[PDB]
Amino acid sequence: RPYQEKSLSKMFGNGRARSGIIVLPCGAGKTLVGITAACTIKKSVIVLCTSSVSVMQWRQQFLXXXXXXXXXXXXXXXXXXXXXXXXXXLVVSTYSMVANXXXXXXXXXXXXXXXXXXXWGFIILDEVHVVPAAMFRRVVSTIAAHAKLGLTATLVREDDKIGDLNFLIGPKLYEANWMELSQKGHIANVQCAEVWCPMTAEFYQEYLRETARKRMLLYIMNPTKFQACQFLIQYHERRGDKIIVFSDNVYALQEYALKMGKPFIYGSTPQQERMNILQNFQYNDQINTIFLSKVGDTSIDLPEATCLIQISSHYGSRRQEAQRLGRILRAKRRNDEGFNAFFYSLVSKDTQEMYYSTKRQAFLVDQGYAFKVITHLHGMENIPNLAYASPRERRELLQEVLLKNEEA
Template sequence: DYAFESDPSLAKLDLVLRPEIEVRPYQTEALKAVVNQDSQDSSKHTVKSGIIVLPCGAGKSLTSILIAAAIKKPVLVVCSTIIAAEQFCNEFLRFTTLMASKTGMFAGAKKWPFNGPSGVLFTTYTMLVDNKNRASDSKRMANFVHSTDWGVIILDEVHQVPASGYSKAITKLKARVRLGLTATMLREDEKIEDLNTIVGPTLYHAKWKELADRGYIAKVICTQIETSMTDIVQKAYDAVQPSNGNQNNMLGHSHHLKSLLAILNPSKMQICQRLIQYHEARGDKILVFCDHIDAIKLYAEKLDRPLIYGGTSTEDARNLLQRFQIDAQKEQINTLFLSRIGDTSLDLPAATVIIQVSSHFGSRRQEAQRLGRILRAKKRSEKGFYSRFYTLVTTETHEITFSEKRRQFLEEDCGYGYQ
């Protein structure tokens, strides 16, 4: 445990929550699980390293800001994308009295330190990984990050840290406390256990269903729609044979081809189109997810809706996200197609409906993260309001097996019924 009040070696950070900010009871519980301020003697106040698990939309950022404001030492915030780092920076400025000059950025082309001996720096996991070919300004910023003694490092989407390279980069940083944030302690490769060593144990874990019942996050109706293939596509699917040439490669290729046919099943596209039309007419905001880049490009083109994927520039993505959030008739976007890039770190409180046309095998974490995109729906407090989560599945294909695994997770771990 770190006795932060009695450590004069780190410069104090003037970080105070704005008086009008409303803190929810479970956020206070999370704060108490991490920071011990029970003693009358402030020199005995301590903070420990570990992980906070809160559903998307339950205010993970604010919870971590509460902890940083209690410690009042230099903060490093590590995010998964540039947009997420910018969003986190905006939250610090919105929720606290922190001056903009006390924030620094080391993400993409934005590279500047904060002013003075203490502040908050925002970066991404990618920027922390050693890169021999860094430009001089990046080298200077990397040196700043590594030479600074951080009071607390906030690791957003901490489940990504066990990825090779990231964990090594994190352990090299000098920090009194490491605080991980995630919506789900799941990785399909079982490496989640590594977080115990790299960050610390889970200190607070809020149950999704409980928060929904208390009105903090939206209630969700999950629906799986199963559709069979058209005869032509079924014939093509059955005709795909693994070649005896390079077994591994070809098996991979045949699986790729079969999954593409299952996604591009015309009946599935038709159902997707009808759901979009139905929900747009009701004034909903819809996110359509597909992991397969070629397939999602085709869907977006055929259904004439905008798309954000890895090849979309940060500027275009930012513009589309802003237009998705607004209700003005002229500029607004009501449906947005997203590749796997939309699984994490996009702040989209306007979204009320998700349509999943394909997903990453049976990944439970991905299912939870996608569901999280509609948990903070702005209308969540309206009587009788439910967000909707649709999974479209082609029958008699591998999609059925994978969807069962994910469905079981949502029912058992998150408490959401499927229909």
Template sequence: MQPDHARRPIWVCENGRIIFETFHPQAAQVADFLIAVSEPVSRPQIVHEYQITALSLNAAIANGIDVEQIIKVLRKLSKNVVDENFLEFIREKGKSTGKLRLILRDGRHFLESEDAPLLRHLCSNADVAACLVEELAQESHVVEVDSMKVEKLKLAAHQLTLPLLQEYEFRRDREDTNPQLAAVLRPTVYLRPYQQRALSKMFSVDDVAKSGIVVLPCGAGKTLVGIAACCRVGRRALVLTTTAVAVDQWRRQIQLYTSLPPEDVYTLTAEQKRPIEDADRRACIVISTYSMLGFTGRRGGDTQFILDQLQQLEWGLLVVDEVQVMPARTFRTVATMIKSHCCLGLTATLVREDDLIQDLHWLIGPKLYEANWQQLQDEGYLARVRCIEVWCDMSTEFFTEYLQAADSPDVPGSMRATLQRALWTCNPHKLKTCEYLIRFHEQRGDKIIVFSDNIFILKDFARRLGRYYICGSVDMRERMQILSEFQESSACNTIFLSKVGDNAIDLPVANVIVQISSHYGSRRQEAQRLGRILRPKPQTSNSSRGKFNAYFYSVVSRDTQELYHANRRQQFLVEQGYNYQ
């Protein structure tokens, strides 16, 4: 222990775990430092936990933070004497991080470094050498990479703990290959302080854009951050998102926030296919979905022509919305099939139930910025949500069937879990509770979203209550009509959504969620659904500053496996400081 340990805010463990007392007088400045050099593990109200990892150090050094500066600040803030072995680990990471760059120039990829011995060491690896167009010349600082093998090169460098930086000097790019984009933010657009901080991490050096990931809560304005980045880079931009509804929302937000002419905003979906006119000389923003670019089957002639355009052009910026879905095997090739100088990933939930989330650090880049959910709530940028888990007893008949299904010889083994899930979802007591909550909040004048992954219950329950529903079988036109009526009409106060509404749907008027069926223990889905009501709410007679103005109900069947899944689903939000009652 340091003699003045009581005045110091953190404890640094031998394994890089950091315990942070948030009641320290300089807590805000300490938190900014910790989020820059480490990964947040848990951030409730009083004590936060962070973890310094190789990836977090890569991100810190890429953002221009010197290794010795990190060590100096850790020693200054720590209550205990920081372990020397851990400090040596930090120094070792600093020797190679930030010194290797992957550059796109005239449609060709190059690997370069000012440290010729380090570049030679990397290229001596067999997996790396297989990705090169030619052998690295002696004492050379640059070598060409096969553009079809960029993903393999990134993975090989990551496995050697020699991460590659992707940076873009956008002011120096040539007009003939990447023309200037005539887009600036409108004078009335205001960037919130945390949005400005996120952008400052991406553009920490003037006229240089860094590839990486920005993590902001749902409803905190990730779309505006992406649009502002497109305007700052000022070159062709390609935006990828998850659904056609999200594509339309991006299009409308670009037209709302920027001066870009509508004819320079292109959308590529199953229903909208407009080729880029005069593609070689036109600066534009194209918005599409992962599935449109990642689909490997046969395509129509119009679609294939547009995709060929996208792959042939150079893009100044690739914006990857809901970036947590990109590591999926069907989508990950999208990041390398597009020739982009820089890539910005946006997400609220940098979590997956598999181990693929770590792949984003080499597919996209390091985490540039992550906001604190509770801090944004306290500052009024997010709604104050009350999270409630409602336990419902199973009816006698349903509970009997549930218990018998576990080992019934009449039910195939592969179907037992499915049958049990259907029984706890269709529990009559649960559905009655849901109906009560809907009617109670409708009488208050609230706007309610009911989530159900079970499509049968979704449709049947919505029809019985006379409410609209949206699922995969509802076409795009009808979806937009339902969402518009929910937003604007007092006659439509409740809608039922399947998992198609989990993300990338903007419904700022919604302030109540009732969840009756979910995808097992998915932490990401829980956070995304909460995010549908996180937009800041106007003050009403039912709310005042410091009081709850949004409600998230998770209705579960007692004494079933659903309780176990519900507990796991809540872990991410609990780590962000939310409490379930």
């Protein structure tokens, strides 16, 4: 990819003594850039990752290059260990395993052999936006190499600590514009859209009488959000496109999941059921609407479903939802003549959550994506299958929300 050689030209310029951060999309090949840099340096390279799936991907890249089984390419994890050799090495480690404090499973010595014997020379950190934390400062404080590299896709955080990475690892060298990359490769056009649904009177006065995170249980459970949600679901099913529903709250995800009758993936869920739901979403055309929480978004991103719906949201964590949204957008690439990606933000008027979703839309403006407002698409008035459209169901839902407030 041209931008990858545009990033490698900086390494080809000076050669020795360099450190910086390279911003590349998730769908791009930053791991290939790490492989090329590993071929240019030829030394013990350590790749800092947070999940085993990324370790398996880096191992697949090592297989795409050459060798992995002979005593040279090592693997560090809490399950097994593998030997290494000087002058050339490729190993992937976990942040929580290298960090620690005093808990030990007779494996911290195996890491202190890679760090004690001084077999290093190249540092690779996956997702640098997570570095602003004490454990990563300890990791950097326990390592020292000749060349450092930071592979990440985003860096927008409101912790005011992203600027420290300019001296902890190095200043950002190349930031690729996702619009020009969309022109190089169709990574699904980004259509940002907020749905403005009216707010009922009872949920408005009860919403004002509530506060903190409890008023979210009155912002999400609005009947017009159920009507507009069903209208968007039936609309996308009529267009023949799969639907992914995001929710920062597990309770709302279970409510919409059970009322819509679709599979759901949330916390404390068996992994076999998660894999079954994933296979049903990949193969079965009857399941075109999935309800995914943060566990289903951080662990895996699927290239299907051009329809992304956002209902639940948390205060301040708008940039993280923009990063996950960006992961689902960049995950969809196949060079199509159309390829229209639709992001909907179900927001209710006069609520305290839309005013942060606007900050998320500001983050979506900083990336160059297109944003437009949507009050209501004509067609919901012709859907007799809408729930909570009658005053009876609205009063019953009001009583259910009041009971939910009495439980919390």
